[PDB]
Design a protein around this ligand. Structure first.
Ligand SMILES: [K+]
Ligand SMILES: [Mg+2]
Ligand SMILES: [Mg+2]
Ligand SMILES: [Mg+2]
Ligand SMILES: [Mg+2]
Ligand SMILES: [Mg+2]
Ligand SMILES: [Mg+2]
Ligand SMILES: [Mg+2]
Ligand SMILES: [Mg+2]
Ligand SMILES: [Mg+2]
Ligand SMILES: [Mg+2]
Ligand SMILES: [Mg+2]
Ligand SMILES: [Mg+2]
Ligand SMILES: [Mg+2]
Ligand SMILES: [Mg+2]
Ligand SMILES: [Mg+2]
Ligand SMILES: [Mg+2]
Ligand SMILES: [Mg+2]
Ligand SMILES: [Mg+2]
Ligand SMILES: [Mg+2]
Ligand SMILES: [Mg+2]
Ligand SMILES: [Mg+2]
Ligand SMILES: [Mg+2]
Ligand SMILES: [Mg+2]
Ligand SMILES: [Mg+2]
Ligand SMILES: [Mg+2]
Ligand SMILES: [Mg+2]
Ligand SMILES: [Mg+2]
Ligand SMILES: [Mg+2]
Ligand SMILES: [Mg+2]
Ligand SMILES: [Mg+2]
Ligand SMILES: [Mg+2]
Ligand SMILES: [Mg+2]
Ligand SMILES: [Mg+2]
Ligand SMILES: [Mg+2]
Ligand SMILES: [Mg+2]
Ligand SMILES: [Mg+2]
Ligand SMILES: [Mg+2]
Ligand SMILES: [Mg+2]
Ligand SMILES: [Mg+2]
Ligand SMILES: [Mg+2]
Ligand SMILES: [Mg+2]
Ligand SMILES: [Mg+2]
Ligand SMILES: [Mg+2]
Ligand SMILES: [Mg+2]
Ligand SMILES: [Mg+2]
Ligand SMILES: [Mg+2]
Ligand SMILES: [Mg+2]
Ligand SMILES: [Mg+2]
Ligand SMILES: [Mg+2]
Ligand SMILES: [Mg+2]
Ligand SMILES: [Mg+2]
Ligand SMILES: [Mg+2]
Ligand SMILES: [Mg+2]
Ligand SMILES: [Mg+2]
Ligand SMILES: [Mg+2]
Ligand SMILES: [Mg+2]
Ligand SMILES: [Mg+2]
Ligand SMILES: [Mg+2]
Ligand SMILES: [Mg+2]
Ligand SMILES: [Mg+2]
Ligand SMILES: [Mg+2]
Ligand SMILES: [Mg+2]
Ligand SMILES: [Mg+2]
Ligand SMILES: [Mg+2]
Ligand SMILES: [Mg+2]
Ligand SMILES: [Mg+2]
Ligand SMILES: [Mg+2]
Ligand SMILES: [Mg+2]
Ligand SMILES: [Mg+2]
Ligand SMILES: [Mg+2]
Ligand SMILES: [Mg+2]
Ligand SMILES: [Mg+2]
Ligand SMILES: [Mg+2]
Ligand SMILES: [Mg+2]
Ligand SMILES: [Mg+2]
Ligand SMILES: [Mg+2]
Ligand SMILES: [Mg+2]
Ligand SMILES: [Mg+2]
Ligand SMILES: [Mg+2]
Ligand SMILES: [Mg+2]
Ligand SMILES: [Mg+2]
Ligand SMILES: [Mg+2]
Ligand SMILES: [Mg+2]
Ligand SMILES: [Mg+2]
Ligand SMILES: [Mg+2]
Ligand SMILES: [Mg+2]
Ligand SMILES: [Mg+2]
Ligand SMILES: [Mg+2]
Ligand SMILES: [Mg+2]
Ligand SMILES: [Mg+2]
Ligand SMILES: [Mg+2]
Ligand SMILES: [Mg+2]
Ligand SMILES: [Mg+2]
Ligand SMILES: [Mg+2]
Ligand SMILES: [Mg+2]
Ligand SMILES: [Mg+2]
Ligand SMILES: [Mg+2]
Ligand SMILES: [Mg+2]
Ligand SMILES: [Mg+2]
Ligand SMILES: [Mg+2]
Ligand SMILES: [Mg+2]
Ligand SMILES: [Mg+2]
Ligand SMILES: [Mg+2]
Ligand SMILES: [Mg+2]
Ligand SMILES: [Mg+2]
Ligand SMILES: [Mg+2]
Ligand SMILES: [Mg+2]
Ligand SMILES: [Mg+2]
Ligand SMILES: [Mg+2]
Ligand SMILES: [Mg+2]
Ligand SMILES: [Mg+2]
Ligand SMILES: [Mg+2]
Ligand SMILES: [Mg+2]
Ligand SMILES: [Mg+2]
Ligand SMILES: [Mg+2]
Ligand SMILES: [Mg+2]
Ligand SMILES: [Mg+2]
Ligand SMILES: [Mg+2]
Ligand SMILES: [Mg+2]
Ligand SMILES: [Mg+2]
Ligand SMILES: [Mg+2]
Ligand SMILES: [Mg+2]
Ligand SMILES: [Mg+2]
Ligand SMILES: [Mg+2]
Ligand SMILES: [Mg+2]
Ligand SMILES: [Mg+2]
Ligand SMILES: [Mg+2]
Ligand SMILES: [Mg+2]
Ligand SMILES: [Mg+2]
Ligand SMILES: [Mg+2]
Ligand SMILES: [Mg+2]
Ligand SMILES: [Mg+2]
Ligand SMILES: [Mg+2]
Ligand SMILES: [Mg+2]
Ligand SMILES: [Mg+2]
Ligand SMILES: [Mg+2]
Ligand SMILES: [Mg+2]
Ligand SMILES: [Mg+2]
Lengths: 208, 38, 174, 141
RNA sequence: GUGAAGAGGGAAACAACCCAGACCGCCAGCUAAGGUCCCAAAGUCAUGGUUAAGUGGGAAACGAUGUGGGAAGGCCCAGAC
RNA sequence: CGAUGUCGGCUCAUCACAUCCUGGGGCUGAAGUAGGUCCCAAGGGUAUGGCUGUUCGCCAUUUAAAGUGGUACGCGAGCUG
RNA sequence: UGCUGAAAGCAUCUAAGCACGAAACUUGCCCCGAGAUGAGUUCUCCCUGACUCCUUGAGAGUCCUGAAGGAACGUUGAAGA
């Protein structure tokens, strides 16, 4: 199915033969089920979960009630996962990191680090025009953005300057290294999106 | 096969057929005489 | 026209039924069903079957003459049961049947397990020969055509899967 | 002497059902578009939406002559750099059977606010069941 | 001949093509070109055929047991193809 | 003509298919390897240098390939000159 | 490329019918996405006081109540012009 977990930086695991494998330390606390959606009411089968612990004043009543419907404590944020027909869960159940004990690889989804207003050099890997040889006020500019009279217009999806990052991105089929049950951790090989403290939706690899 | 615009019966065993709109000249003796179109 | 004007004989122990246009012929080998074309009109007249072209429709004789020649084969199928004799030519080529799955080894890196749709009875008198039987000419012919299509005759040594009746043109090296 | 024009407030709109099973697409779509517009009514006014509400159930079972089941194509652009998407009459029914009658009627209705207003009147459906039992939609042929 | 110096209806849009020459008004009727299932006024008109290619709704030499009409020309009961 | 900046390069591209590579097929004077030609196929990919303002071209060395064209012989209120 | 099979005693992949068949096409993978005005669904939360007036209209008031929640303000951020 999948679990929600905060990103807690990166380390490396030295294997006894020698190889130092770079790992991202994902803390994955008891992900507790707030709601179970089904075909009769909703038209699809899914589960809504929660994690962490939000201060009671910060949780509003429309969500304070929503948690009382289930019986669980008010976790910070809510996320949904689609069920793969066979499995079925109940409201108030606590899903832990032990689900990834069996799996080998995982897709990790997160929110990428915000680079703000980025230019075409950084954003789209555009080439910087000649830094000298007569160049006038146009080193890092995009150059042309179209043709002439024929279109007489710029085409849609033209690669231009704009907001870069702060977008949800997915890294697929990262190899799981260690699944720590006692500290509630999930060590995955490589790097996953977002900064330390950003939330990560970790789930089993669709590309098997 | 050939896709010439003027297919014709080359040898004796050549046979004209209209498959899916297109005229074809299928042959038993020589596969060289197999030809489409026209 | 000419085929259409030649009644199909129906031997004893061959239950024929005409559900409007949907024909059902049951026999000893297998029960066969044929959804026939709307332009054809078919009836029972004495022992034999009759196939008439419908008035109003453009191409009748062509459609009916087909029904005739189909049901002719359909009656022979349920009575006798058709067979096809395939042979595998070339060293290292092997054919062995386990149940309803033909294990073809045809010089590949993986032994090819061909499945048999419908009532098709597969046999092997020798290790390099496949004799398969059944009710329909259609399914037999197709199965045979796939079993062939895995390795067609090489026009040099005649290597591959061949029909027994088929002649193959080989040529010299140049 | 100031001839009659149908005043919206006074327009008494009616509900209908049409089973499109085995019907010719265009010949259905036409007779729909004539009704939706309110041509059949003797108080027809071109600037007022006088026509009737229609429910077209069993849209997927609509019939077409010749080889148009495969040959008839429905093109549309995505508004993108080189994005021209086509879908044949089969492929269209495989994904979205409502779109077939929709597009066949929309082309036959006028183009503009009232034309879009008289499209809304139409209610296409893939399944035989319709949830507009509340209006007592009478049978039309 | 038309435009130039002529509006109006038709030919999708289209000075010169087809129809036709605006003195002004009317919420009258008959017709021209061109049209009459829907966009859009009027035939889902009548009868007899053709077309199966979506031809109609761009094109040649040449190619083809497509498919309709015809007018002829090669054989039978010694039974031809 | 009361001004539509004309070659080449850079930057940025986009479409066509008459396909250079990669994918699927027919024939072959197709043993295999490698071709030859033809057919369908536009998803993606498609050199770096020397010389010259060059486009092109020749040459050196790579590459699976180093496609042919349209886009004001694309692109100067984007650069160069 | 075939299978069965006429029209056309046969023959032939097709006219009924039936199987295969590619980086193309539709999905599958990632992202945005109910302003999808056709504005979908689920879930939770909150408001349960009176009087006038008239053309008794989806009306206009007059005090009284001000909720859920939001915005504003502050400290700010691996968010950001
Ligand atoms: K607030
Ligand atoms: Mg619930
Ligand atoms: Mg759904
Ligand atoms: Mg606290
Ligand atoms: Mg408080
Ligand atoms: Mg808040
Ligand atoms: Mg969310
Ligand atoms: Mg989602
Ligand atoms: Mg996310
Ligand atoms: Mg940031
Ligand atoms: Mg960069
Ligand atoms: Mg980068
Ligand atoms: Mg550079
Ligand atoms: Mg540079
Ligand atoms: Mg300068
Ligand atoms: Mg300067
Ligand atoms: Mg400078
Ligand atoms: Mg300046
Ligand atoms: Mg310019
Ligand atoms: Mg324009
Ligand atoms: Mg891996
Ligand atoms: Mg050609
Ligand atoms: Mg074909
Ligand atoms: Mg594309
Ligand atoms: Mg003059
Ligand atoms: Mg005029
Ligand atoms: Mg005029
Ligand atoms: Mg006009
Ligand atoms: Mg014209
Ligand atoms: Mg003109
Ligand atoms: Mg005009
Ligand atoms: Mg005239
Ligand atoms: Mg006059
Ligand atoms: Mg005059
Ligand atoms: Mg006059
Ligand atoms: Mg007047
Ligand atoms: Mg009169
Ligand atoms: Mg009149
Ligand atoms: Mg006329
Ligand atoms: Mg006409
Ligand atoms: Mg119009
Ligand atoms: Mg109009
Ligand atoms: Mg008009
Ligand atoms: Mg009309
Ligand atoms: Mg009628
Ligand atoms: Mg009639
Ligand atoms: Mg007729
Ligand atoms: Mg014509
Ligand atoms: Mg043409
Ligand atoms: Mg000719
Ligand atoms: Mg000819
Ligand atoms: Mg004829
Ligand atoms: Mg003729
Ligand atoms: Mg005749
Ligand atoms: Mg005559
Ligand atoms: Mg005659
Ligand atoms: Mg000037
Ligand atoms: Mg001037
Ligand atoms: Mg000027
Ligand atoms: Mg100029
Ligand atoms: Mg110049
Ligand atoms: Mg240069
Ligand atoms: Mg250069
Ligand atoms: Mg570029
Ligand atoms: Mg093309
Ligand atoms: Mg060529
Ligand atoms: Mg090459
Ligand atoms: Mg490759
Ligand atoms: Mg291959
Ligand atoms: Mg090839
Ligand atoms: Mg090949
Ligand atoms: Mg080869
Ligand atoms: Mg090799
Ligand atoms: Mg050679
Ligand atoms: Mg080659
Ligand atoms: Mg050629
Ligand atoms: Mg091509
Ligand atoms: Mg293209
Ligand atoms: Mg390309
Ligand atoms: Mg492309
Ligand atoms: Mg494309
Ligand atoms: Mg694709
Ligand atoms: Mg790319
Ligand atoms: Mg390139
Ligand atoms: Mg060079
Ligand atoms: Mg030098
Ligand atoms: Mg070299
Ligand atoms: Mg090489
Ligand atoms: Mg090579
Ligand atoms: Mg080469
Ligand atoms: Mg080329
Ligand atoms: Mg070129
Ligand atoms: Mg152009
Ligand atoms: Mg051009
Ligand atoms: Mg040019
Ligand atoms: Mg030019
Ligand atoms: Mg050019
Ligand atoms: Mg230029
Ligand atoms: Mg160019
Ligand atoms: Mg330029
Ligand atoms: Mg500038
Ligand atoms: Mg200078
Ligand atoms: Mg100079
Ligand atoms: Mg046959
Ligand atoms: Mg004939
Ligand atoms: Mg055959
Ligand atoms: Mg299938
Ligand atoms: Mg298939
Ligand atoms: Mg193939
Ligand atoms: Mg493959
Ligand atoms: Mg594949
Ligand atoms: Mg690939
Ligand atoms: Mg998304
Ligand atoms: Mg959304
Ligand atoms: Mg989403
Ligand atoms: Mg909504
Ligand atoms: Mg929304
Ligand atoms: Mg908008
Ligand atoms: Mg919508
Ligand atoms: Mg609605
Ligand atoms: Mg009250
Ligand atoms: Mg009151
Ligand atoms: Mg008033
Ligand atoms: Mg009110
Ligand atoms: Mg009131
Ligand atoms: Mg009130
Ligand atoms: Mg108060
Ligand atoms: Mg108070
Ligand atoms: Mg207040
Ligand atoms: Mg207050
Ligand atoms: Mg209070
Ligand atoms: Mg408050
Ligand atoms: Mg509050
Ligand atoms: Mg909020
Ligand atoms: Mg706030
Ligand atoms: Mg705001
Ligand atoms: Mg602030
Ligand atoms: Mg600060
Ligand atoms: Mg700051």
């Amino acid at each position: 199915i999948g679990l929600v977990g905060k990103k807690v930086g990166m380390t490396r695991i030295f294997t006894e033969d020698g190889v130092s494998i770079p790992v991202t330390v994902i803390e994955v606390e008891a992900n507790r089920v707030t709601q179970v959606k089904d075909l009769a009411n909703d038209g699809y089968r899914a589960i809504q979960v929660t994690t962490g612990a939000k201060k009671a004043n910060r949780v509003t009543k429309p969500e304070a009630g929503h948690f009382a419907k289930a019986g669980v404590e008010a976790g910070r944020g809510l996320w949904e996962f689609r069920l793969a027909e066979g499995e079925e869960f109940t409201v108030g159940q606590s899903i832990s990191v032990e689900l990834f004990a069996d799996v080998k690889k995982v897709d990790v989804t997160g929110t990428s680090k915000g680079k703000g207003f980025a230019g075409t050099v950084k954003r789209w890997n555009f080439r910087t025009q000649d830094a000298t040889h007569g160049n006038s006020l146009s080193h890092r500019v995009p150059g042309s953005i179209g043709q002439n009279q024929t279109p007489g217009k710029v085409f849609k999806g033209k690669k231009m300057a704009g907001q870069m990052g702060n977008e949800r991105v997915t890294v697929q089929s990262l190899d799981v290294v260690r699944v720590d049950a006692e500290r509630n951790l999930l060590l995955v090989k490589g790097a996953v999106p977002g900064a330390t403290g950003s939330d990560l939706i970790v789930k089993p690899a669709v590309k098997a | 096969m050939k896709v010439r615009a003027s297919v014709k019966k080359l040898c004796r065993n050549c046979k004209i057929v209209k498959r899916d709109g297109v005229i074809r000249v299928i042959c038993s003796a020589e596969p060289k005489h197999k030809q489409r179109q026209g | 026209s000419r085929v259409a004007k030649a009644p199909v004989v129906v031997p004893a122990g061959v239950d024929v039924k005409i559900n409007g246009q949907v024909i059902t012929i049951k026999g000893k080998n297998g029960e066969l069903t044929r959804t026939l074309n709307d332009a054809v009109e078919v009836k029972h007249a004495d022992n034999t079957l009759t196939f008439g072209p419908r008035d109003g429709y453009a191409d009748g004789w062509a459609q009916a003459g087909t029904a005739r020649a189909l049901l002719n084969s359909m009656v022979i199928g349920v009575t006798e049961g058709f067979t096809k004799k395939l042979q595998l030519v070339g060293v290292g080529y092997r054919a062995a049947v386990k149940g309803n799955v033909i294990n073809l080894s045809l010089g590949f890196s993986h032994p090819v397990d061909h499945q048999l749709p419908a009532g098709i009875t597969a046999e092997c008198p020798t290790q390099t020969e496949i004799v398969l039987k059944g009710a329909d000419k259609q399914v037999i012919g197709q199965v045979a055509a796939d079993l062939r299509a895995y390795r067609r005759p090489e026009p040099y040594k005649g290597k591959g899967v061949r029909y027994a009746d088929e002649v193959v043109r080989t040529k010299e090296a140049k | 002497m100031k001839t009659f024009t149908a005043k919206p407030e006074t327009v008494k709109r009616d509900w209908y059902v049409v089973d499109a099973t085995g019907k010719t697409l265009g010949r259905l779509a036409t007779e729909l578009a004539r009704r939706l517009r309110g041509k059949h009514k003797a108080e027809y006014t071109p600037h007022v939406d006088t026509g009737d509400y229609i429910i077209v159930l069993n849209a997927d079972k609509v019939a077409v002559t010749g080889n148009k089941r495969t040959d008839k194509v429905y093109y549309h652009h995505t508004g993108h750099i080189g994005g021209i998407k086509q879908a044949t009459f089969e492929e269209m029914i495989a994904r979205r059977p409502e779109r077939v009658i929709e597009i066949a009627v929309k082309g036959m209705l006028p183009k503009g606010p009232l034309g879009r207003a008289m499209f809304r009147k139409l209610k296409v459906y893939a399944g035989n069941e319709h949830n507009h039992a509340a209006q007592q939609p009478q049978v039309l042929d």
